[PDB]
Design an enzyme around this catalytic site. Structure first.
Site, PDB file in Angstrom:
ATOM      1  N   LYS A 165       5.351   2.987 -29.027  1.00 49.62           N
ATOM      2  CA  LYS A 165       4.248   3.643 -29.724  1.00 49.62           C
ATOM      3  C   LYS A 165       4.752   4.673 -30.729  1.00 49.62           C
ATOM      4  O   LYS A 165       4.260   4.736 -31.862  1.00 49.62           O
ATOM      5  CB  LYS A 165       3.306   4.303 -28.718  1.00 49.62           C
ATOM      6  CG  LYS A 165       2.688   3.349 -27.711  1.00 49.62           C
ATOM      7  CD  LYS A 165       1.785   4.095 -26.740  1.00 49.62           C
ATOM      8  CE  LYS A 165       2.564   5.118 -25.934  1.00 49.62           C
ATOM      9  NZ  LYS A 165       3.615   4.472 -25.102  1.00 49.62           N
ATOM     10  N   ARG A 202      -4.320  10.262 -21.902  1.00 48.14           N
ATOM     11  CA  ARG A 202      -3.454   9.647 -20.913  1.00 48.14           C
ATOM     12  C   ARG A 202      -4.116   9.470 -19.555  1.00 48.14           C
ATOM     13  O   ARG A 202      -3.572   8.749 -18.711  1.00 48.14           O
ATOM     14  CB  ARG A 202      -2.162  10.464 -20.746  1.00 48.14           C
ATOM     15  CG  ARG A 202      -0.994   9.653 -20.227  1.00 48.14           C
ATOM     16  CD  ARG A 202       0.330  10.213 -20.690  1.00 48.14           C
ATOM     17  NE  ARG A 202       0.750   9.633 -21.961  1.00 48.14           N
ATOM     18  CZ  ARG A 202       2.018   9.534 -22.342  1.00 48.14           C
ATOM     19  NH1 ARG A 202       2.979   9.968 -21.540  1.00 48.14           N
ATOM     20  NH2 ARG A 202       2.329   8.998 -23.514  1.00 48.14           N
ATOM     21  N   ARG A 240      17.470   5.289 -24.867  1.00 49.92           N
ATOM     22  CA  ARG A 240      16.952   6.079 -25.973  1.00 49.92           C
ATOM     23  C   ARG A 240      17.819   7.309 -26.206  1.00 49.92           C
ATOM     24  O   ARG A 240      18.175   8.022 -25.263  1.00 49.92           O
ATOM     25  CB  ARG A 240      15.509   6.501 -25.701  1.00 49.92           C
ATOM     26  CG  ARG A 240      14.923   7.411 -26.773  1.00 49.92           C
ATOM     27  CD  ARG A 240      13.403   7.430 -26.729  1.00 49.92           C
ATOM     28  NE  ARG A 240      12.896   7.962 -25.468  1.00 49.92           N
ATOM     29  CZ  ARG A 240      11.626   7.886 -25.083  1.00 49.92           C
ATOM     30  NH1 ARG A 240      10.730   7.298 -25.863  1.00 49.92           N
ATOM     31  NH2 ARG A 240      11.252   8.398 -23.918  1.00 49.92           N
ATOM     32  N   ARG A 242      16.861  12.852 -23.581  1.00 56.89           N
ATOM     33  CA  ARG A 242      15.832  13.664 -22.948  1.00 56.89           C
ATOM     34  C   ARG A 242      15.993  13.636 -21.432  1.00 56.89           C
ATOM     35  O   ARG A 242      16.412  12.632 -20.848  1.00 56.89           O
ATOM     36  CB  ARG A 242      14.443  13.167 -23.349  1.00 56.89           C
ATOM     37  CG  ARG A 242      14.169  13.262 -24.841  1.00 56.89           C
ATOM     38  CD  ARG A 242      12.910  12.506 -25.238  1.00 56.89           C
ATOM     39  NE  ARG A 242      12.051  12.214 -24.094  1.00 56.89           N
ATOM     40  CZ  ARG A 242      10.879  11.594 -24.180  1.00 56.89           C
ATOM     41  NH1 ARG A 242      10.419  11.200 -25.360  1.00 56.89           N
ATOM     42  NH2 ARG A 242      10.164  11.368 -23.087  1.00 56.89           N
ATOM     43  N   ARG A 297       7.841   7.891 -13.894  1.00 56.58           N
ATOM     44  CA  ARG A 297       6.883   7.839 -14.992  1.00 56.58           C
ATOM     45  C   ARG A 297       6.159   6.499 -15.035  1.00 56.58           C
ATOM     46  O   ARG A 297       4.951   6.449 -15.290  1.00 56.58           O
ATOM     47  CB  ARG A 297       7.591   8.103 -16.321  1.00 56.58           C
ATOM     48  CG  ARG A 297       8.086   9.528 -16.493  1.00 56.58           C
ATOM     49  CD  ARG A 297       8.986   9.647 -17.710  1.00 56.58           C
ATOM     50  NE  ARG A 297       8.267   9.345 -18.943  1.00 56.58           N
ATOM     51  CZ  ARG A 297       8.848   9.195 -20.129  1.00 56.58           C
ATOM     52  NH1 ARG A 297      10.164   9.317 -20.245  1.00 56.58           N
ATOM     53  NH2 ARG A 297       8.114   8.923 -21.199  1.00 56.58           N
TER      54      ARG A 297
HETATM   55  N1  LIG Z   1      10.294  -3.081 -31.034  1.00 53.80           N
HETATM   56  C1  LIG Z   1      11.296  -2.697 -30.247  1.00 53.80           C
HETATM   57  N2  LIG Z   1      12.109  -3.580 -29.659  1.00 53.80           N
HETATM   58  C2  LIG Z   1      13.139  -3.108 -28.847  1.00 53.80           C
HETATM   59  N3  LIG Z   1      13.270  -1.728 -28.675  1.00 53.80           N
HETATM   60  C3  LIG Z   1      12.406  -0.900 -29.276  1.00 53.80           C
HETATM   61  C4  LIG Z   1      11.444  -1.385 -30.071  1.00 53.80           C
HETATM   62  N4  LIG Z   1      10.751  -0.364 -30.558  1.00 53.80           N
HETATM   63  C5  LIG Z   1      11.294   0.748 -30.083  1.00 53.80           C
HETATM   64  N5  LIG Z   1      12.354   0.429 -29.341  1.00 53.80           N
HETATM   65  C6  LIG Z   1      13.045   1.541 -28.664  1.00 53.80           C
HETATM   66  O1  LIG Z   1      12.079   2.224 -27.871  1.00 53.80           O
HETATM   67  C7  LIG Z   1      12.783   3.355 -27.189  1.00 53.80           C
HETATM   68  C8  LIG Z   1      11.319   3.545 -26.735  1.00 53.80           C
HETATM   69  O2  LIG Z   1      10.503   3.599 -27.899  1.00 53.80           O
HETATM   70  P1  LIG Z   1       9.452   4.650 -28.437  1.00 53.80           P
HETATM   71  O3  LIG Z   1       9.255   4.344 -30.019  1.00 53.80           O
HETATM   72  O4  LIG Z   1       9.890   6.048 -28.175  1.00 53.80           O
HETATM   73  O5  LIG Z   1       8.132   4.163 -27.729  1.00 53.80           O
HETATM   74  P2  LIG Z   1       7.161   5.212 -27.108  1.00 53.80           P
HETATM   75  O6  LIG Z   1       5.995   4.161 -26.719  1.00 53.80           O
HETATM   76  O7  LIG Z   1       6.669   6.163 -28.126  1.00 53.80           O
HETATM   77  O8  LIG Z   1       7.386   5.757 -25.628  1.00 53.80           O
HETATM   78  P3  LIG Z   1       6.000   6.570 -25.244  1.00 53.80           P
HETATM   79  O9  LIG Z   1       5.557   6.603 -23.672  1.00 53.80           O
HETATM   80  O10 LIG Z   1       5.614   7.691 -26.162  1.00 53.80           O
HETATM   81  O11 LIG Z   1       7.004   7.654 -24.537  1.00 53.80           O
HETATM   82  P4  LIG Z   1       7.690   9.079 -25.030  1.00 53.80           P
HETATM   83  O12 LIG Z   1       7.086   9.766 -26.408  1.00 53.80           O
HETATM   84  O13 LIG Z   1       8.221   9.975 -23.941  1.00 53.80           O
HETATM   85  O14 LIG Z   1       6.246   9.561 -24.416  1.00 53.80           O
HETATM   86  P5  LIG Z   1       5.746  11.124 -24.299  1.00 53.80           P
HETATM   87  O15 LIG Z   1       6.345  12.037 -25.508  1.00 53.80           O
HETATM   88  O16 LIG Z   1       4.259  11.165 -24.311  1.00 53.80           O
HETATM   89  O17 LIG Z   1       6.324  11.739 -22.937  1.00 53.80           O
HETATM   90  C9  LIG Z   1       5.441  11.875 -21.845  1.00 53.80           C
HETATM   91  C10 LIG Z   1       5.674  13.290 -21.296  1.00 53.80           C
HETATM   92  O18 LIG Z   1       5.320  14.740 -21.258  1.00 53.80           O
HETATM   93  C11 LIG Z   1       3.999  14.961 -20.822  1.00 53.80           C
HETATM   94  N6  LIG Z   1       2.818  14.406 -21.596  1.00 53.80           N
HETATM   95  C12 LIG Z   1       2.803  13.913 -22.839  1.00 53.80           C
HETATM   96  N7  LIG Z   1       1.552  13.589 -23.150  1.00 53.80           N
HETATM   97  C13 LIG Z   1       0.775  13.925 -22.126  1.00 53.80           C
HETATM   98  C14 LIG Z   1      -0.540  13.817 -21.945  1.00 53.80           C
HETATM   99  N8  LIG Z   1      -1.234  13.284 -22.947  1.00 53.80           N
HETATM  100  N9  LIG Z   1      -1.133  14.224 -20.816  1.00 53.80           N
HETATM  101  C15 LIG Z   1      -0.350  14.775 -19.803  1.00 53.80           C
HETATM  102  N10 LIG Z   1       1.025  14.876 -20.017  1.00 53.80           N
HETATM  103  C16 LIG Z   1       1.554  14.459 -21.178  1.00 53.80           C
HETATM  104  C17 LIG Z   1       4.286  14.195 -19.497  1.00 53.80           C
HETATM  105  O19 LIG Z   1       5.528  14.618 -18.945  1.00 53.80           O
HETATM  106  C18 LIG Z   1       4.485  12.988 -20.307  1.00 53.80           C
HETATM  107  O20 LIG Z   1       4.856  11.918 -19.428  1.00 53.80           O
HETATM  108  C19 LIG Z   1      13.550   3.663 -28.504  1.00 53.80           C
HETATM  109  O21 LIG Z   1      14.870   3.200 -28.365  1.00 53.80           O
HETATM  110  C20 LIG Z   1      12.760   2.808 -29.414  1.00 53.80           C
HETATM  111  O22 LIG Z   1      13.418   2.774 -30.690  1.00 53.80           O
END
Ligand SMILES: Nc1ncnc2c1ncn2[C@@H]1O[C@H](COP(=O)(O)OP(=O)(O)OP(=O)(O)OP(=O)(O)OP(=O)(O)OC[C@H]2O[C@@H](n3cnc4c(N)ncnc43)[C@H](O)[C@@H]2O)[C@@H](O)[C@H]1O
Length: 214
Positions: free
Chosen positions: A13, A88, A123, A156, A167
């Site tokens: 995402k 979320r 990552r 991270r 998670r």
């Molecule tokens: N097409 C592809 N093919 C192969 N590989 C690929 C690819 N595309 C990408 N890749 C590789 O993907 C890896 C993953 O890709 P990535 O592009 O980072 O995908 P991502 O979907 O954005 O992962 P998301 O769950 O956001 O997780 P992240 O930001 O931790 O989530 P958050 O900041 O919310 O962290 C969550 C943490 O903090 C808190 N938090 C955040 N939001 C909330 C909330 N809304 N409510 C309560 N707590 C929250 C909690 O601790 C929460 O869990 C990279 O290597 C990427 O390049």
């Protein structure tokens, strides 16, 4: 204009969030960024999420609902927004409902569980810039170094494979029901749903998004 990005952790995402930002000029509201920024600067509205993000648990719905409420009140409203990480939980989705925030699209980044761990453990990020890398799937030009600044990349704390499984469990429990939540809303004609194959390369995923949006 106003869309929500759903998907399991590591579905891609945040990667596609950067593209949608540039292609369609709507701001990206990422709760993970805002919390990690509040912790980094010791900001009172968010610094409490330090120990629980590192633990892999979710932040209290109220704290992120207020930070999203404050972030949305900053932007000009018709600029739109691009929510990445919010809502979320069901209470977070109900908060947008009660606050009169309807969305135009919900984009589901479907990815099998068998890719989740590998996407996240591999990552690496450049924390000062938010740039994101993967050792295998999207690597930096130089190993361990950032492509723009040359600084040593970081992992991270919640990207430890053990915390990832915590998670992924919590995602299935608290966050996954949003797929059925917003699919029911799409069936009621309150928004427009769209499922995206997150297993493709990033080039094709960005192409599929273009056909859905414009
Ligand atoms: N097409 C592809 N093919 C192969 N590989 C690929 C690819 N595309 C990408 N890749 C590789 O993907 C890896 C993953 O890709 P990535 O592009 O980072 O995908 P991502 O979907 O954005 O992962 P998301 O769950 O956001 O997780 P992240 O930001 O931790 O989530 P958050 O900041 O919310 O962290 C969550 C943490 O903090 C808190 N938090 C955040 N939001 C909330 C909330 N809304 N409510 C309560 N707590 C929250 C909690 O601790 C929460 O869990 C990279 O290597 C990427 O390049």
């Amino acid at each position: 204009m106003r869309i929500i990005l759903l998907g399991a952790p590591g579905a891609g995402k945040g990667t596609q969030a950067q593209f949608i930002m540039e292609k369609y000029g709507i701001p990206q509201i990422s709760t993970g960024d805002m919390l990690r920024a509040a912790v980094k600067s010791g900001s009172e509205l968010g610094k409490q999420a330090k120990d629980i993000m590192d633990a892999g648990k979710l932040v209290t719905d109220e704290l992120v609902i207020a930070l999203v409420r404050e972030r949305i009140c900053q932007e000009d409203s018709r600029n739109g927004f691009l929510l990445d990480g919010f809502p979320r939980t069901i209470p977070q989705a109900d908060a947008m409902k009660e606050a009169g925030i309807n969305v135009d699209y919900v984009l589901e980044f479907d990815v099998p569980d068998e890719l989740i761990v590998d996407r996240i453990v591999g990552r690496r990020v450049h924390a000062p810039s938010g740039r994101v890398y993967h050792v295998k799937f999207n690597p930096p030009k130089v190993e361990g170094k950032d492509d723009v600044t040359g600084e040593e990349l970081t992992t991270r704390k919640d990207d430890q494979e053990e915390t990832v499984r915590k998670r992924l469990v919590e995602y299935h429990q608290m966050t996954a029901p949003l797929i059925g939540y917003y699919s029911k809303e799409a069936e009621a004609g309150n928004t427009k749903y769209a499922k995206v194959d997150g297993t493709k390369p990033v080039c094709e995923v960005r192409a599929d998004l273009e056909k859905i949006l414009g």
